[PDB]
């Protein structure tokens, strides 16, 4: 089960994207929303990430590369990208494969690293965070 805070993060990301009329809710919208999801935020602070710079790089990339639906088009609305779907599915899988059920924003952060052609994974590595960095933090704290 996606925990409550993760679910709050996802629904607001989606609402923000719909309000901006974006054709897609991307893995970048997802990472941007995790910046303020306690669980994922804590992991990132533990990796000494400049959350202000990352927020900015995410917002710029999002508005510059996400197609906007025509004021006309009201028959189709904001859809998640395939990459976004895979990340959620991967986060559930990683948690279940360890015998647990609660999915947190930090597990979703771990799953983002597997979308190798995503700007989100790129940016995370650019800020020197590895998948294992996040897993160690989840397993062993700071």
């Amino acid at each position: 089960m996606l925990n409550q805070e993760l679910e709050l993060s996802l629904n607001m990301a989606f609402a923000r994207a719909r309000e901006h009329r974006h054709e897609f809710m991307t893995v970048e919208h997802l990472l941007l929303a995790l910046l303020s999801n306690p669980s994922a935020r804590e992991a990132l602070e533990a990796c000494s990430v400049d959350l202000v710079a990352l927020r900015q790089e995410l917002e710029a990339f999002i508005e510059q590369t996400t197609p906007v639906l025509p004021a006309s088009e009201e028959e189709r609305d904001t859809q998640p990208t395939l990459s976004f779907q895979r990340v959620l599915q991967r986060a559930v899988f990683h948690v279940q494969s360890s015998g647990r059920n609660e999915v947190t924003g930090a597990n979703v952060l771990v799953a983002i690293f597997s979308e190798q052609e995503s700007q989100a994974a790129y940016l995370l590595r650019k800020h020197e965070v590895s998948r294992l960095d996040v897993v160690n933090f989840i397993s062993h704290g700071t």
């Binding site: 897609f24 893995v27 996400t66 197609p67 990459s83 650019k126």
Partner: protein, 87 residues
């Protein structure tokens, strides 16, 4: 070490003998937001060159547009093939 941003991708419409020109135009307007005129020019390009670029997007967006187009083609029983390749 060395690290580069993922690349941009061209989204392409490939020609076939069964898909009606009208459907190709529909796809271009519905999924790429072209107006009828540009849509029509791209449809002819697909017909004469055998392929045409509908747009350039991030890898993530390109992959989704490709799946949406191919699903819509499939639902309408046409073998219209949409593909992607590094920009």
């Amino acid at each position: 070490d060395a690290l580069k941003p993922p690349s941009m991708y061209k989204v392409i419409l490939v020609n076939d003998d069964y898909t009606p020109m009208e459907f190709v135009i529909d796809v271009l307007q519905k999924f790429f937001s072209y107006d009828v005129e540009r849509a029509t020019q791209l449809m002819l390009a697909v017909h004469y060159q055998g392929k045409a670029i509908c747009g350039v997007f991030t890898a993530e967006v390109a992959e989704t547009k490709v799946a949406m187009v191919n699903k819509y083609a499939r639902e309408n029983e046409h073998p219209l093939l949409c593909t992607l390749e590094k920009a």
